[PDB]
Design a protein around this ligand. Structure first.
Ligand code: NA
Lengths: 512, 512
């Protein structure tokens, strides 16, 4: 039952180029070879290629495959493939390469990853890519990256592997497709259903998953993404701690945890098919496709990027060709009087109690510090989330003295500092003078991340608002754009202080 | 630094007889081939041989290697080897085999394990083996087995791998030498200190092990024995739960758990060297040898089978030759005022407060349901042991109405039953009539194991005492050998019932 890789053969480049390692290593570490440092998304991508995770890929797509993928969701030879995997480069580097040029791809400017043999260098129409691949919405994460982070030139080419990107965390937890397939054989695991996730798992996830295992007669592979998920989500370290904990809530010998160095595009539809392909290469006969699978969410005008079922239908439409089975996850609700989750479909809310916790409410219960029902998520998991996302009483913040203020900045700072220290509780306070220095402005969010309260005497230049981070940063000024608005610019310091103290207290930072 | 298998090459027979599996499988289940059902111990041994764990062995020892092992703890060709791995068969079967004869070794009379090409057939002097290998003391677990269970004819010969013995529990947890070494390579693990154990691990074990890793700059491998340990012990299931729980009390990425299908001989001295060899084949550069390692304990006269440090000394004396480092575990004690364990060596018992819990005191607290300090063993661990080893109020038992009783057996049993039911407490009570049947006597202990209280109307024949089991079985008689001794043979029933009730209450079974 274990699926053959996509395209019939596991492109384990690490294993195929084993004997030539030192040979490739040297060439890569020679001063005669042109060097290109891989960006974060590229590092995740290249790992899956050398890995065989992106079978049948063997390098970054050339214009021929890239175009076929963009317009037909297939490689030039017809193989289903929905996400363009290209090596984006800038004009400068582009002008130093031509077909057959040998490039060395490094990590952190010092670790030899692989040797790339160019065969194509083109300047893709990002308008068409954004439209045909990511549905053209300018706010879509992939399209934003496409235009502001991705180089404007793609470099098609074949790769020869030196070593997979270096990782120092979760060793042996990042099993390659070959290792996973071998692990499944050790356990005599025939049928395996894989679960995609870039989020923490709660009881519902544990139940829906065990259910899939039961109905599909397969074992469970919890395959969390730890490379790059949606921008601004929970760090993977925290998620992995949650996974390692929830894995213990499954009957013994039913589930296995393994991390996927994937860099998502949040391209729902196509991404789902891409996900099915990837797990297939990793050895899964079944793939769970959730509601709005890999969906960013809603845009500015509240419009959804993808339809709630777009992903499940797309994968379902290609499953026979992919030779995998799709396990659709229907929306579910909790029935208190039975202590069980059930498909919304079969519930008459008119004659049955139902409980549900939205992501917003959860984010709120972690901000406020309120209890989280044990039926929604396991105790151990909630504790883990509580540590990473502390309630406002344990959160850091920053109070910036507006430019409109005329009071003694030094005195107001001393006054605020002295005042905050009366409340105590654990938070460390500091009058922070940056002097419009980037080396110091870059530390603001670090102190806030540490729960520290910073009193900042002056504002920084607008051409640096990007160096800081708006999170928990409040402006004290007379302007209508301030978070703490003073009626005048020459108010008594005690007047000003009280306004700030009560503001913070109202926002939950101080508790008495 | 990762040692090379003992003998130079890992004898992973399963891997060398792969391209011959179907072929060998056929011969095994063929009608002509002579078949032999592998005994439980023979299964653990054969699995280690086909495994490679017993490198350089490639089959059971013949008379040449055997005698060499017995007298000089080495194999004919010199190679270090202290424990005699041989195929013990009965007389009858020995007479159907001659040199070059091929035998099919089965598991549970239906699973083809391996084909054996006989080379030797001899009747070893068990009086010499018991002496030179296990020190002679008749009460020694290995010598007892040697005479009362082991066959009298050893069959030497080579083996051809069909498949390792079947296990449905802890799949993928029982990694082979080849697998472990791979698992180590995947984690960039070079130096590995292996920890051996056939018992639960407590905080002391976690601390000593972590300390070992720190001193030898190595990762930790918890390598528990799940085959056959010491007669009458904690089943490997309970211990595995304990291991999987304590394995989580280690710094992330420091330790790894793997099960060893070893059938210990409890041969302290020699077995420690044997363990070092085995662990060496598994990829461990460091091995922990503790106080009275693999020691049976004390005999009747209260005399130790082995000296506290015989095992550490022996392995230490062969380490250079074995090419592995020995990590000695020194006796330790708990320091309350410092919350840490320290060697008895540097502790001024006079000026220092120290706490220790004996194996006997632990056994007592589990029987009584008393508290077990957090410093001694992790809560999760205690929970597990408590559930596997229930305290008296949750224990089962049997009251056997003696032969000397002249009172009505039908009425006494009924009175005991109705009286017991008054107390409640979750225990299930039953009047059990065996009629001296084996099919029924064999269930007595199963019932007691289920926490039940059995009321047995009559004693069973002496020729069947071996079919029952002494644990929590009490005799109500007049004889001085009775557990609940009665003054006369025809005491009023109410009088008898009370003596029995108060006896069970004084012994913990009843709590009010
Ligand atoms: Na990037």
């Amino acid at each position: 039952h274990m699926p053959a890789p996509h395209g019939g053969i596991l492109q384990d480049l690490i294993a195929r180029d084993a004997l030539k390692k030192n040979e490739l290593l040297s060439e890569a570490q020679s001063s005669d070879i042109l060097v290109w440092n891989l960006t974060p998304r590229q590092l995740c991508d290249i790992e899956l290629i050398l890995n065989g995770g992106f079978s049948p890929l063997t390098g970054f797509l050339n214009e021929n495959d890239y175009s076929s993928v963009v317009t037909d969701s297939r490689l030039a030879d017809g193989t289903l493939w929905t996400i363009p995997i290209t090596l984006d480069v800038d004009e400068a580097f582009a002008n130093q390469i031509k077909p057959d040029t040998r490039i060395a791809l490094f990590q952190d400017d010092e670790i030899p990853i692989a040797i790339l043999t160019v065969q194509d260098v083109y300047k893709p129409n990002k308008t068409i890519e954004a439209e045909k691949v990511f549905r053209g919405d300018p706010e879509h994460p992939a399209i934003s990256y496409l235009f502001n982070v991705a180089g404007d030139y793609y470099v098609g080419g074949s790769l020869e592997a030196i070593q997979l990107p270096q990782h120092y965390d979760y060793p042996g937890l990042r099993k390659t497709p070959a290792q996973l397939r071998l692990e499944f054989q050790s356990r005599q695991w025939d049928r395996v259903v894989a679960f995609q996730t870039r989020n923490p798992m709660h009881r519902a996830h544990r139940e829906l998953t065990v259910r899939a295992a039961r109905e599909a007669n397969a074992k469970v592979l919890i395959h969390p993404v730890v490379g790059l998920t949606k921008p601004g989500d929970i760090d993977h370290h925290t998620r992995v701690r949650v996974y390692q904990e929830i894995i213990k809530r499954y009957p013994n010998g039913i589930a296995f945890l393994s991390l996927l160095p994937l860099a998502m595009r949040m391209s729902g539809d196509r991404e789902a098919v891409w996900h099915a392909i990837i797990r297939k290469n990793y050895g899964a006969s079944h793939f769970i496709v959730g509601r709005d699978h890999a969906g960013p969410g809603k845009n500015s005008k509240g419009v959804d990027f993808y339809g709630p079922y777009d992903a499940q239908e797309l994968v379902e439409s290609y499953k026979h060709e992919l030779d995998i089975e799709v396990v659709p996850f229907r929306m579910v609700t909790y029935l208190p009087d039975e202590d069980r989750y059930a498909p919304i479909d079969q519930i008459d809310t008119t004659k049955t109690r139902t409980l549900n916790i939205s992501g917003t409410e959860l984010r709120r219960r972690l901000r406020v510090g309120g209890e989280i029902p044990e039926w929604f998520s396991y105790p151990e998991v909630v504790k883990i989330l509580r540590e990473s996302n502390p309630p406002r009483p344990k959160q850091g913040f920053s109070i910036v003295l507006g430019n409109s203020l005329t009071v003694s900045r030094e005195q107001l700072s001393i006054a605020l500092l002295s005042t905050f220290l009366q409340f105590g509780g654990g938070r460390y306070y500091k009058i922070f003078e940056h002097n419009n220095k980037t080396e110091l402005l870059s530390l603001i969010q670090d102190f806030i991340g540490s729960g520290s309260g910073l009193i900042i005497p002056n504002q920084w230049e607008d051409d640096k608002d990007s160096v800081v981070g708006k999170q928990n940063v409040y402006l004290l000024d007379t302007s209508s754009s301030a978070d703490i608005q003073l009626e005048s610019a020459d108010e008594p310091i005690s007047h000003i202080v009280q306004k700030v103290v009560l503001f913070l207290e109202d926002n939950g930072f101080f508790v008495f």
